[PDB]
Design a protein around this nucleic acid. Sequence first.
RNA 1: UGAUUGGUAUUGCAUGCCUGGUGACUUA
RNA 2: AAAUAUGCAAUCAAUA
Lengths: 69, 48, 144, 53, 93, 118, 112, 123, 114
Amino acid sequence: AEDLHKAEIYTQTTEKLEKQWPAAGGVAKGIQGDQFFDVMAAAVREDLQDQSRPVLVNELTDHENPYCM
Amino acid sequence: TVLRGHCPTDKEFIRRALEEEQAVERIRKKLDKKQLQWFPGKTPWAPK
Amino acid sequence: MAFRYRREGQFTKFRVHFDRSGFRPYIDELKWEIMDWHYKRAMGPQMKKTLMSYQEGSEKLQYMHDLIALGTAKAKFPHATKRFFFVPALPVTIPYRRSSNPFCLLSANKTGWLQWSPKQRVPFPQPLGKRKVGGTDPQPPVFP
Amino acid sequence: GLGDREPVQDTTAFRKKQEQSRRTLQAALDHDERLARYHGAKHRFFDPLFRRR
Amino acid sequence: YGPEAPQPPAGLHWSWWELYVKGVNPEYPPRQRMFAFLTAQGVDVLEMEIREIEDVTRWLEMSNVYGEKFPRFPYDVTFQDKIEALKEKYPLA
Amino acid sequence: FDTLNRSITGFRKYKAPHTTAPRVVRDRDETNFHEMLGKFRFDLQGSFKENGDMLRDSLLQVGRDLFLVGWVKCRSRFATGHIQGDVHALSYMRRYLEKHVDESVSSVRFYEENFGMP
Amino acid sequence: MAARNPGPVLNPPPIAFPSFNRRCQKDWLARRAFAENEVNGRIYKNVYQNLGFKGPIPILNKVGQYRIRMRCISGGYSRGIFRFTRMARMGMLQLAREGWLKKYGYRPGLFR
Amino acid sequence: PAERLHSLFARADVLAHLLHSRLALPLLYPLNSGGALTNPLAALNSIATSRWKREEVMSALATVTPLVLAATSVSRFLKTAHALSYFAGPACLGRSRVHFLRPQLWRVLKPGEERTTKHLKWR
Amino acid sequence: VAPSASLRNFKAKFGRTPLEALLDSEEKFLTSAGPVDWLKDEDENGEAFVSWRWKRPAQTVYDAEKGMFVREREGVDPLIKLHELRQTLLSVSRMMSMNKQGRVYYFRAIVAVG
RNA sequence: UGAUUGGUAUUGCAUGCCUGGUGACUUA
RNA sequence: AAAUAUGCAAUCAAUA
């Protein structure tokens, strides 16, 4: 139950990060344009998600995808 | 777009994409058939 | 052409080389899968028995190892009245390739270990009838 | 939030604490014999044919 | 007691490669001897392939348990030449 | 009639070296009553087409999905069978035979029901 | 035959763990020797073709691709072996009947 | 009216979606032969009531039935249109057998119908 | 709202609506599933399933001393109380028959019951 | 590019698995 | 007829 709760918390955190640091024009278009602000925002969001990703007890696979977790 | 479950892109765009795909498929088939060999690396009259 | 979809596979089956038909083999995967099955079936229960043998110093050893590795050891034991359950696991032996597929279930693994479950209602290598999977009964036979 | 700007996991103090924890674990293993086996237990894998024979 | 914990190379929580190379898991005294000998010679064993590691292990075991005349290689090749080639290919850091 | 009916022949057939009957687990509650096994026999009378091939295929598919075991026998006007498996699977099979058969089923009968088999 | 004294029903041998077979071991040795010496044979052939001479290469007799045979992986027999299976008749039969091929599209209900 | 006819089929599609949503579940939903009876979820009556009434679902299905019966009028109209689309216009001894006088009986394995002749001998 | 003629006829000939009968059958199937049968208690709020009872196999009788069920055999007169009869095996023999493939063995038994 | 715990010696009249030939497979 | 200069299989129009 605690692992499921942590997974739900992680999904909520990912949604909050997506709303807080949206990538204008789409991820692919931002990558192709290669603007400093877009790169900074994407890196910040990715690092925050990496930091917030939990460590569950019953699974030894630290899935970075909230869907998979 | 109006009908549910149908592709929303332009029909002419789809036609152009399909024609390009068919042309590239024909080119690929021609090239593969020409370059195919049972004993790869063998050229006629070369020292065998 | 009275039965098209019935004969759909005939062309590849009969009049095409394997190297050019596009058919994808299975040997290079089942070879590792069978050994994985045998290794798991042999080692999992023994691992669980070894884990549950003492059953009193498990938390103490976990605490000491957490102190040695992380230096905090409060991730699993915030206070004295918190219980950390140990899930049996075995080394992963089949060299699966890490892939960019975000939905891959064995690409984000970083520990080199996988959780093992003794319970599986559906037997995976379902034999035909009375046949038993080889290597299942090690007891010597008895003759009349 | 972000992580540690200057993590201390690469510090001599951390290394000394790790050594102290290792010494404590070794002392506990020496003191307790059941714990010693429960920690040093090893299990090798052998062929099912070899098991049969 | 107990085996020393593995050192993750980068972005990992474990490494079976180091344990295998050192012959700790699976435990194999011949592989431990191979690792020690290559480390003393100055060969980065972790950078070697499985084939080369097994070949060196077999050669060392044969030399130890049959004599210095063995192993014997054709074309006047020598175990010293093999070791020199391995050292040149994988300098020890 | 049953697929396990055999007559004793004149040549020795290997017998079980020992005899050990697994015990019947009688301490079953709501948390464990789903792990019990069972068996029953069924007889259907009516009209079926293709000499019962359609019903045979349907029953085989249902049994393959439900992991049931045993045997079935379908013909033009009748069907019989002996089914074994988990209690829930047996109940599903009974419901299917009673209500979910695409042939004329004038009569259905269930008999020789047993539960709690090891 | 109607055996007079039938024996117990024996559990079949493991699929992935064949018994010792020195012939299979030597086949593996030949495979690895060919893998190691493949480049040298190419160099031999390049030199001979450049010099315009059809000379033999004796070492290929020992370290060539043609010293390798398709031997059953699970049985060790060196005949009736297909690349799509790498196993002989009985190895294939045991693998199929144990249920290891259902995942890989095997259709036991198909004759042709 | 024009707008009424414009919105008629959209509103009919809304009705059809409602019917589909209702029919996409078992009749006695959420009743079940498992957790429903073996693992019930008093102080918690506000979030989960063990009590349950069938009249609600019965009335829902009773109201659903006539709506689908009416929707069958769509099928009737489509069939009428299909039949009309194939209209033509103004109006303009012994047995015969092919492929044997009678079908042949086989006592040997037929290469085609092996699924029915497998039990028979191959020679 | 006036019921339709078909519904009225169905009620007259069965006493329940078609939906009522269908849902009664479905509820009975869902409740009498597995090895047990659940009991329903009805009040103002609604129905609930709080108790279950073991299902009794058809045409079987529970023996107290054995603690298990035993089947009821046809041909026997059900009026006779089998718990006050006893039996003795006088003789059992291995008879033989001959068929195309060889010899077939069956058994004969003589038993006294009183 | 990840090798291995002897015998293709007798005994198919010790057997398992797997095949050939002949017989069968009827219900409500 | 200032159109053509004409033999057929065992795959593919959900794409030649």
